[PDB]
Design an enzyme around this catalytic site. Structure first.
Site, PDB file in Angstrom:
ATOM      1  N   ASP A   1       0.807  -1.224   0.000  1.00 29.55           N
ATOM      2  CA  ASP A   1       0.000   0.000   0.000  1.00 29.55           C
ATOM      3  C   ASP A   1       0.845   1.282   0.000  1.00 29.55           C
ATOM      4  OD1 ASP A   1      -1.885   1.904   0.240  1.00 29.55           O
ATOM      5  OD2 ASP A   1      -2.858   1.082   2.026  1.00 29.55           O
ATOM      6  N   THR A   2       0.966   1.921  -1.168  1.00 24.71           N
ATOM      7  CA  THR A   2       1.725   3.156  -1.296  1.00 24.71           C
ATOM      8  C   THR A   2       1.042   4.325  -0.604  1.00 24.71           C
ATOM      9  OG1 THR A   2       0.653   3.623  -3.435  1.00 24.71           O
ATOM     10  CG2 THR A   2       2.721   2.350  -3.466  1.00 24.71           C
ATOM     11  N   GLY A   3      -0.252   4.210  -0.310  1.00 25.22           N
ATOM     12  CA  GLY A   3      -0.968   5.234   0.417  1.00 25.22           C
ATOM     13  C   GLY A   3      -0.870   5.171   1.918  1.00 25.22           C
TER      14      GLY A   3
HETATM   15  C1  LIG Z   1      -6.797   6.768   3.034  1.00 25.35           C
HETATM   16  C2  LIG Z   1      -5.265   6.691   2.921  1.00 25.35           C
HETATM   17  C3  LIG Z   1      -4.641   8.115   2.905  1.00 25.35           C
HETATM   18  C4  LIG Z   1      -4.700   5.987   4.166  1.00 25.35           C
HETATM   19  N1  LIG Z   1      -5.018   4.528   4.247  1.00 25.35           N
HETATM   20  C5  LIG Z   1      -4.342   3.565   3.302  1.00 25.35           C
HETATM   21  C6  LIG Z   1      -5.285   3.304   2.098  1.00 25.35           C
HETATM   22  O1  LIG Z   1      -4.621   2.584   1.115  1.00 25.35           O
HETATM   23  C7  LIG Z   1      -6.454   2.446   2.626  1.00 25.35           C
HETATM   24  C8  LIG Z   1      -5.995   1.012   2.933  1.00 25.35           C
HETATM   25  C9  LIG Z   1      -7.295   0.221   3.305  1.00 25.35           C
HETATM   26  C10 LIG Z   1      -7.868  -0.847   2.385  1.00 25.35           C
HETATM   27  C11 LIG Z   1      -9.126  -1.612   2.684  1.00 25.35           C
HETATM   28  C12 LIG Z   1      -9.833  -1.328   3.999  1.00 25.35           C
HETATM   29  C13 LIG Z   1      -9.272  -0.284   4.969  1.00 25.35           C
HETATM   30  C14 LIG Z   1      -7.993   0.460   4.641  1.00 25.35           C
HETATM   31  N2  LIG Z   1      -7.410   2.368   1.551  1.00 25.35           N
HETATM   32  C15 LIG Z   1      -8.723   3.007   1.539  1.00 25.35           C
HETATM   33  O2  LIG Z   1      -9.174   3.608   2.465  1.00 25.35           O
HETATM   34  O3  LIG Z   1      -9.413   2.799   0.346  1.00 25.35           O
HETATM   35  C16 LIG Z   1     -10.867   3.176   0.340  1.00 25.35           C
HETATM   36  C17 LIG Z   1     -11.070   3.826  -0.778  1.00 25.35           C
HETATM   37  O4  LIG Z   1     -11.139   2.597  -1.862  1.00 25.35           O
HETATM   38  C18 LIG Z   1     -11.673   1.582  -1.226  1.00 25.35           C
HETATM   39  O5  LIG Z   1     -10.805   0.343  -1.359  1.00 25.35           O
HETATM   40  C19 LIG Z   1     -10.248   0.082  -0.172  1.00 25.35           C
HETATM   41  C20 LIG Z   1     -11.147   0.842   0.935  1.00 25.35           C
HETATM   42  C21 LIG Z   1     -11.695   1.887   0.262  1.00 25.35           C
HETATM   43  S1  LIG Z   1      -5.348   3.920   5.778  1.00 25.35           S
HETATM   44  O6  LIG Z   1      -5.537   2.477   5.668  1.00 25.35           O
HETATM   45  O7  LIG Z   1      -6.402   4.728   6.370  1.00 25.35           O
HETATM   46  C22 LIG Z   1      -3.826   4.171   6.656  1.00 25.35           C
HETATM   47  C23 LIG Z   1      -2.744   3.119   6.598  1.00 25.35           C
HETATM   48  C24 LIG Z   1      -1.453   3.422   7.302  1.00 25.35           C
HETATM   49  C25 LIG Z   1      -1.274   4.713   8.085  1.00 25.35           C
HETATM   50  C26 LIG Z   1      -2.341   5.724   8.164  1.00 25.35           C
HETATM   51  C27 LIG Z   1      -3.673   5.455   7.425  1.00 25.35           C
HETATM   52  O8  LIG Z   1      -1.943   6.710   8.867  1.00 25.35           O
HETATM   53  C28 LIG Z   1      -0.461   6.510   9.122  1.00 25.35           C
HETATM   54  O9  LIG Z   1      -0.187   5.223   8.841  1.00 25.35           O
END
Ligand SMILES: CC(C)CN(C[C@@H](O)[C@H](Cc1ccccc1)NC(=O)O[C@H]1CO[C@H]2OCC[C@H]21)S(=O)(=O)c1ccc2c(c1)OCO2
Lengths: 99, 99
Positions: free
Chosen positions: B25-27
């Site tokens: 996860d690059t995000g």
């Molecule tokens: C929203 C971004 C800026 C941050 N997130 C990582 C994302 O990749 C997250 C990773 C994620 C993936 C699945 C469930 C929960 C989190 N994906 C996500 O929210 O995606 C949503 C939008 O598309 C949909 O597909 C996935 C969920 C929906 S996170 O999981 O909230 C997160 C991970 C590590 C962190 C953090 C926040 O703060 C500091 O360290």
């Protein structure tokens, strides 16, 4: 480009004719942008993230340019903490992960 | 390897003696793992994303093998719905975004 990950992979995007900064987010299925005025029809939807579920406006078939690469697809607009570019558009710009 | 983004970029990881599936996860700034009972000292932390915040336990200098590549760093454990490999460890295995 080849982007390393010691920093957030933030890039300039253009949507609705307006420039913004967004995060290239391989962990996001969908593209979710902070609340903004956007031309186009929308429908209300729910999406879940790490902290729970939010209401968003789903805009279909939206033109959006990502670091110089054009895409056309679904953009969700709602109270996300960050503008995230998800896999639905990362595939359109030919993005891969490599190691 | 090269990983396309048509599907979620799930890989096998090894941590605390367990094999698990996790998102590259690059995000994600940090690595966040689903509830597990790791040994050692920890300190509480709050991390926010879509939907709000979750409370997690922060463990330092944890060994994680990611798709055959060894890494060591900070690992957060809490009620996340998915195991997330964040940038702190993605850089250690040489992972880049390419388009
Ligand atoms: C929203 C971004 C800026 C941050 N997130 C990582 C994302 O990749 C997250 C990773 C994620 C993936 C699945 C469930 C929960 C989190 N994906 C996500 O929210 O995606 C949503 C939008 O598309 C949909 O597909 C996935 C969920 C929906 S996170 O999981 O909230 C997160 C991970 C590590 C962190 C953090 C926040 O703060 C500091 O360290």
């Amino acid at each position: 480009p080849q982007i390393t990950l010691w920093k957030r992979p933030l890039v300039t995007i253009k949507i609705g004719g307006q420039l913004k900064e967004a995060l290239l987010d391989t962990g996001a299925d969908d593209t979710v942008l902070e609340e903004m005025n956007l031309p186009g029809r929308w429908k209300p939807k729910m999406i879940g993230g790490i902290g729970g579920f939010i209401k968003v406006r789903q805009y279909d078939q939206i033109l959006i340019e990502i670091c110089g690469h054009k895409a056309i697809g679904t953009v969700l607009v709602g109270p996300t903490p960050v503008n995230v570019i998800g896999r639905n558009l990362l595939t359109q710009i030919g993005c891969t992960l490599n190691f």
